[PDB]
Paper text:
Transthyretin (TTR)3 is a 55-kDa protein that aggregates into amyloid fibrils under pathological conditions. In its native tetrameric conformation, TTR transports retinol-binding protein and thyroxine (T4) in the blood and cerebrospinal fluid. Amyloid aggregation of TTR occurs by dissociation of tetrameric TTR into monomers; these partially unfold into amyloidogenic intermediates and self-associate into soluble oligomers and amyloid aggregates. Here we identify two segments of TTR that drive protein aggregation by self-association and formation of steric zipper spines of amyloid fibrils.
Familial amyloidotic polyneuropathy is caused by a number of TTR mutations, including L55P and V30M, which we examine here. Familial point mutations are known to destabilize the tetramer, leading to faster dissociation and consequent amyloid aggregation. The combination was also effective at blocking aggregation of the familial mutants V30M and L55P at physiological TTR concentration. Also our computations with ZipperDB show that TTR familial mutations do not increase the propensity of fibril formation (data not shown). These results support the hypothesis that familial point mutations destabilize the quaternary structure rather than creating new amyloidogenic segments.
Numbering used by the authors:
A (entry chain A), B (entry chain B), C (entry chain B), D (entry chain A): 10 to 124
């Protein structure tokens, strides 16, 4: 798994479960093409997003459906979603983990890029 | 000022100065229309983004050009930008402060909403 | 005001009001001596914590009473408090803003240091 | 492992390696007693901090040596350390993960408490 997403809930102190995660890759015509998607498991991760063959260099967007998550918990959210946009560059062997920490009026994201 | 943006640098421990901030509003055809833009001052804020008359109900996107900021400091950044997407004024006019905290491989954002 | 504290609530999207803030300074015997304390106003800040004369070089601790804040809102919190520990004025007098963002199971803090 | 600590670096986009982690438990006399310690591995975690038998209810403090970490990377840090203080209550079967995200002038922490 060269691309992993981990979503945590800062209100309940737990992984954010049943969250929709959509991944897009910037096409040559500058539009966002669907790339991969899933729903977070009990661990807060959508399993098997992509492969080493499909995940080439490019600009990617990871859209997390935070609005549906907070609505399902009966909590009033601020954001429509959380979108993380980054260039993936292969320098040496690399795996990307995009971690997101959610609060109703805030989110934090970080990337963990390992050899 | 019904819409304020405050940008901080978590590496240098200071306001993030000379950062481009672009605001868009979702059109009826689902596209992102330009709404307002500016550059952060010494306080990390772009002054005078919009007015109470222009800032109507709708879906807004605040895009912070974090990539050009880190490149100007000679630091290799991960993200293309930091984008915050939210519905504004659905229950009547509100004042919105969007705060962003930047690191080369991470960012946090929060909203402070007042009547 | 050489030492400022700003506290925000990531659940409600507002300043965290009526929060107790306690400041200590490390004594020569390595114990924590009381230095200053206050209560956050409607803006999420305790006004007038210290002066340029009193705020000398040293190691300071800013303890934010997040537990009483969440209990007063009927929300079960994880942390006993949020504590920020730092050396101040080692290279000469500076102005320090300690910003804290609160969630029931998480907090973020950042420092903005200016000459 | 009922108590886990995970430390990430927001500047390098990686786990924070070789970071000292010290855990204390509040004694009946209100002092902080040493409980467990270790140094983070390649994954940003100190392995085998405690056991289900030793990790009883109480008030715990997790101190992360962020200052030595940033100094070892040649980066000027703000904080002396990052301290996370919380009550551990057993309601049902529970595991605690304390996650910390580090920047030179900022840190974020969250707790993940699972059944």
């Amino acid at each position: 798994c060269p691309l992993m997403v981990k979503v945590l809930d800062a209100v309940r102190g737990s992984p954010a479960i049943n969250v929709a995660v959509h991944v897009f890759r910037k096409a040559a015509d500058d539009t966002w093409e669907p790339f991969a998607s899933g729903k977070t498991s009990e661990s807060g991760e959508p399993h098997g997003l992509t492969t080493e063959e499909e995940f080439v260099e490019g600009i990617y967007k990871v859209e997390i459906d935070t609005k549906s998550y907070w609505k399902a918990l009966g909590i009033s959210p601020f954001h429509e979603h959380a979108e993380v946009v980054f260039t993936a560059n292969d320098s040496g062997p690399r795996r990307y983990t995009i971690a997101a920490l959610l609060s109703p009026y805030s989110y934090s994201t970080t990337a963990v890029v390992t050899n």
